[model samples]
Target: CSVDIQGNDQMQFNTNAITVDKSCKQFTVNLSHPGNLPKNVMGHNWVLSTAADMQGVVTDGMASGLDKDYLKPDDSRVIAHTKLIGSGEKDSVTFDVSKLKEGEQYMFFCTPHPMKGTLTLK
Candidate 1:
């Protein structure tokens, strides 16, 4: 199954929660930026990891810069991610549903900004 999330210039995501049906063998996250700014200045991406690893991922990703989508190259803590997008742009990331375990806390966020949300497998 799939879901769509939006990020804007105000440094926010459209929603703060998501749920994935366990029957889905694969899951896809579609990210879009609806603001009128450039990626270097107001980039938005969707990064997923365990709640425990969110801060560390964001910390390391900050140093990677916009060109790297603000994500550390080959970062193992990342479960899935989409490319950074600018105004009116879109990107998507797909991962195996098996990567998620029930009862585990998962978080998704934008690396360049404080936008974030919670995700759960149901």
Candidate 2:
């Protein structure tokens, strides 16, 4: 599946859930932060990992600091990710569809707007 998302300084993402299916040999995610706020004050990024990895991903990510986009460098928990961005910044990442385990649950989310979140699969 291919996905495009825009984030705002309001701590919300334009869309939440995205999907991956057997038909897609690879999936792409394009992320855009259209807000006018700077990173830290209102930075955003797209990160993909496993549901079981979310907790540790976030924990290690938190320790990763601003330079590392609030995530540990080369952390194995990350399957794929886009660089952290601020207002008007953008990034994209693509991963193999085979990397996604069939029937396994997957989710997408934002750090600041952790509440306004969603998940998807196929």
Candidate 3:
């Protein structure tokens, strides 16, 4: 599956989940902020980490500050991430599929917004 999704200023994603096809050696997540606001006030980013590590990771990330995208800098547990974006802005990141295992679970979400949750990769 190809990944091209949107996350709005209301702190909502266009889709609850996405799947990266096994045939695609690399996957891309395109982030678009459609609301009218700056990155600082209503910043949203795409973060990838293991399922079990997601909560604790996001908790610690909040302390890392906005300059760090409110995420810990170069966190080892984090698989991949996209830079924070705001209203009308767009960003993308391509990551190798090798980082993921065949049967392992991975999670993607944003910070400070608790509604974000599991994205089943099928």
Each model's number of backbone clashes?
0, 1, 0
Q: Among all windows of ten consecutive residues in candidate 2, which has the lowest summed lDDT?
A: 110-119
TM-score of each: 0.97, 0.88, 0.91
Off by over 4 Å in 2: 112-119
lDDT of each: 0.92, 0.75, 0.79
Q: Sorted on TM-score, highest at the top, how do the candidates line up?
A: 1, 3, 2
Per-residue lDDT of model 2, residues 32-93, tens digit only: 98868998678887777778787777778777677888777988877787778899888898
User: How many angstroms is residue 57 displaced in model 2 relative to the true structure, after the best TM-score fit?
Assistant: 0.6
Candidate 2 backbone overlaps, count = 1
> Which candidate has the top score in TM-score?
1
- In model 2, what lDDT does residue 67 have? 81
Task: Give RMSD to native, each candidate.
Answer: 0.8, 1.8, 1.5
Cα misplacement distance, residue 17 of candidate 3 (Å)? 0.6
Error of 3 at 92 (Å): 0.4
Instruction: Give lDDT tens digits, candidate 3, residues 7-105.
Output: 777888887777777777778888888888789888888888888888877988898978988788878888878888888888898888888886678
lDDT of 1 by residue, 4-110 (tens): 89999999999999899988999999999897999889989999999999999999999988789999999999999999999999999999999997678999999
Better of 1 and 2 by TM-score: 1
Candidate 1 regions with alpha-carbon error over 4 angstroms: none
